[PDB]
DNA sequence: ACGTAACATCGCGGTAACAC
DNA sequence: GTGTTACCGCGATGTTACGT
């Protein structure tokens, strides 16, 4: 345990930079995997575009979270499609399993 | 270890006789001695060169790495693109 | 022994564009 | 407004040659 993180069936290693499902690899790009990172590690909480941008992207074209999120829920599947929760006029959110 | 010997006084390494350079070797016990852990090229810079160079070379050594271990065992060096390299373990 | 030179490959990922 | 999928420039890595 360096910087691992566990939510429900997903596991974030950023040590060997790998996110499993429930030993199901993910093949996520770079940012797909700072974009799930960042939200996993503030589970519940909703985040914004702007603030997403600024901390998963860096300090216009503010639909490449909304891209991402989608490529990852895809990415996901059916089966933990909701982990990415959306709120409408507001931004995303990772949602806990129960 | 895993069909992999690599003696450290010798700089040397086998796989079940590998001659490599000793960049070459620093690098793949860097990258062995903490195995499945992806390392940036700042990180193989610092630790593994001496300099702090933009540089090419981490992607070059890798590549004359791969080439001695073969088709069979090139594998066992994982690249993760934007961030760096890892060993894989077989 | 090593680190540029230099190009080939291919995946990143941001915009477009429309459905709803 | 957001879900969503193309499309394709660009840039990260591969790769080998060659100069030191």
Same mark, same amino acid.
């Not at 909480?45 to 901390?55: I, K, Y």
């Given at each position: 345990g360096d910087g691992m993180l566990t939510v429900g069936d997903l596991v974030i290693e950023e040590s060997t930079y790998t996110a499993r499902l429930k030993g199901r690899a993910l093949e996520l790009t770079y940012?797909? &995997?700072e974009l799930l990172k960042y939200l996993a590690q503030h589970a519940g909480?909703? &985040?914004?575009?702007? +603030? $997403? $941008? +600024?901390?998963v992207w860096g300090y216009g074209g503010t639909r490449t979270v909304d891209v991402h999120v989608r490529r990852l829920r895809a990415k996901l599947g059916p089966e933990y499609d909701s982990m990415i929760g959306t709120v409408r006029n507001v931004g995303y959110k990772f949602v806990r399993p129960s």
């Open positions: 940012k797909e &995997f909480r909703v &985040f914004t575009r702007a +603030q $997403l $941008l +600024q901390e």
